[model samples]
Target: GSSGSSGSGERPYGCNECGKNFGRHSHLIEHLKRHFREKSSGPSSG
Candidate 1:
């Protein structure tokens, strides 16, 4: 028989505005870009 390994679920990255947590920085960056795009357009869908 073989043994299995486990890990903990922790988020090191967080959004400055909403405080949303993420495991990786890339995801956080993509999310932030979406926020910026949405904020830039006025009454127009992206």
Candidate 2:
């Protein structure tokens, strides 16, 4: 039972907002950055 590495070919973490799965926690966290950035930016300035 290998852990802590995606080299085992397993994705346990999932993003509820987009239903996307990540092979590692860090990967999921990185993906969430995009959502956070978009939300903070708001709609449009024009």
Candidate 1 is scored at a TM of 0.56
Maximum-TM-score candidate: 2
Query: Which pairs clash in the backbone of model 2?
Result: none
Model 2 residue 8 distance off true place after TM-score fit, in angstroms: 8.7
Write down the lDDT of every candidate, Cα atoms only.
Answer: 0.78, 0.81
Tens-digit per-residue lDDT, 1-46, candidate 1:
6554557677888898667889998989987886677565568555
Under the 3 Å rule for N, CA and C atoms, how many clashes does model 1 have?
A: 0
TM-score of each: 0.56, 0.59
Per-residue CA lDDT of candidate 2, range 1-46, in tens? 8767555576799899768998888999999898877656576775
Candidate 1: misplaced stretches above 4 Å? 1-8, 39-46
